[PDB]
Amino acid sequence: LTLKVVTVLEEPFVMVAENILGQPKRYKGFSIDVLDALAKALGFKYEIYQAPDGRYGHQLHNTSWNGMIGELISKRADLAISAITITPERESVVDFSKRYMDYSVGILIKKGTPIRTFQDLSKQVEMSYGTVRDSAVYEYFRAKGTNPLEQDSTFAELWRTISKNGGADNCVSSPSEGIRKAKKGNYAFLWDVAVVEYAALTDDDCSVTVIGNSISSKGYGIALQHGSPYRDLFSQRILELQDTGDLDVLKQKWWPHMGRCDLT
Amino acid sequence: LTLKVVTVLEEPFVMVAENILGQPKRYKGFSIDVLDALAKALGFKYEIYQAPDGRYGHQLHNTSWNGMIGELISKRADLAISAITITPERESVVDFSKRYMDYSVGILIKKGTPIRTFQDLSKQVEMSYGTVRDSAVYEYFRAKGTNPLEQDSTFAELWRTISKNGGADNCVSSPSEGIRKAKKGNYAFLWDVAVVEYAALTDDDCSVTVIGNSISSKGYGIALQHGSPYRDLFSQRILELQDTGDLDVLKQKWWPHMGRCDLTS
Ligand SMILES: *[C@@H]1O[C@H](CO)[C@@H](O)[C@H](O)[C@H]1NC(C)=O
Ligand SMILES: *[C@@H]1O[C@H](CO)[C@@H](O)[C@H](O)[C@H]1NC(C)=O
Ligand SMILES: [Ca+2]
Ligand SMILES: [Ca+2]
Ligand SMILES: [Ca+2]
Ligand SMILES: [Ca+2]
Ligand SMILES: [Ca+2]
Ligand SMILES: [Cl-]
Ligand SMILES: [Cl-]
Among the bound ligands, name the one nearest to the CA of residue A72: 3
Q: Is A204 exposed, middle or buried (0-12, 13-18, 19+ CB in 10 A)?
A: exposed
CA of B92 to the centre of ligand 6 (A): 4
Question: Rounded to whole angstroms, what are the CA distances from A30 to A99, A201, A255?
Answer: 13, 15, 9
Domain boundary among B211, B230, B245: B211
Residue A263 maps to a domain: no
Question: Best substitution site from A62, A63, A68, A93 to test ligand 1's pocket, by max atoms within 8 Å of Cβ?
Answer: A62
Show the domain range for A151: 105-211
Residue B110 maps to a domain: yes
Question: Rounded to whole angstroms, what are the CA distances from A176 to A108, A179, A180, B83?
Answer: 12, 5, 6, 40
Are A12 and A142 in a shared domain? no
Quick check: B245 and A151 CB within 8 A?
no
Are B233 and B176 in a shared domain? no
Are A165 and A72 in a shared domain? no
Residue A105 assigned to a binding site: no
Are B39 and B79 in a shared domain? yes
Kindly list the protein residues that place their beta carbon closer than 5 angstroms to ligand 5, a single-atom ion: B 83
When CB atoms are compared, the residue of B213, B219, B236 closest to A91 is B236
Report whether B36 contacts B246 (CB < 8 A).
Answer: no
Quick check: A91 and B151 CB within 8 A?
no
Give the neighbor-by-neighbor strand order of the sheet with A105-110. Answer: A128-130, A187-192, A105-110, A208-211
When CB atoms are compared, the residue of B151, B213, B248 closest to A258 is B151
Are A12 and A32 in a shared domain? yes
In ligand 1, the atom with minimum distance to the C-alpha of A62 is: 1
The resolution, in Å, is 2.2
Are A98 and A6 in a shared domain? yes
Say which CATH number the domain at B77 has: 3.40.190.10
When CB atoms are compared, the residue of B149, B215, B242 closest to A249 is B149
When CB atoms are compared, the residue of A95, A99, A217 closest to B242 is A217
Residue B264 maps to a domain: no
Whole-angstrom Cα distance, residue B82 to residue B16? 12
Report whether A6 contacts A51 (CB < 8 A).
Answer: yes
Quick check: A87 and B239 CB within 8 A?
yes
Among B68, B77, B25, B20, smallest CA distance to B46 is for B77
Are B97 and B110 in a shared domain? no
The SS3 of residue B127 is coil
Residue A36 maps to a domain: yes
Residue B98 maps to a domain: yes
Are B29 and B112 in a shared domain? no
Question: Rounded to whole angstroms, what are the CA distances from A84 to A248, B42, B161?
Answer: 19, 27, 40
Are B237 and B153 in a shared domain? no
Are A236 and A185 in a shared domain? no
A60 lines ligand 1 (CB under 6 A): yes
A242 lines ligand 1 (CB under 6 A): no
Question: Best substitution site from A58, A60, A66, A93 to test ligand 1's pocket, by max atoms within 8 Å of Cβ?
Answer: A60
Whole-angstrom Cα distance, residue B94 to residue B80? 10
Whole-angstrom Cα distance, residue A189 to residue A176? 10
Residues of A in contact with B102 (CB under 8 A): 102, 215-216
Residue B259 maps to a domain: no
- Number of structural domains (chain A) is 2
Residue A262 maps to a domain: no
Are B141 and B193 in a shared domain? yes
Among the bound ligands, name the one nearest to the CA of residue A98: 8
Among the bound ligands, name the one nearest to the CA of residue A216: 9
B23 lines ligand 2 (CB under 6 A): no
Whole-angstrom Cα distance, residue A189 to residue A194? 13
CA of B85 to the centre of ligand 9 (A): 10
Residues of B in contact with A95 (CB under 8 A): 232
Are A133 and A205 in a shared domain? yes
Where in chain B does DSSP place strands (E)? 2-7, 15-16, 27-28, 45-50, 79-80, 95-96, 101-103, 105-110, 128-130, 187-192, 208-211, 218-220, 223-224
Interface test with B, best of A105, A213, A235 (most B CBs within 10 A): A235
Residue A264 maps to a domain: no
Contacts of B129 (CB under 8 A, 6+ apart): B107, B109, B121, B158, B161, B162, B170, B187, B188, B189, B190
The SS3 of residue B97 is coil
B62 lines ligand 2 (CB under 6 A): yes
- Which residue puts its alpha carbon closest to atom 11 of ligand 1? A62
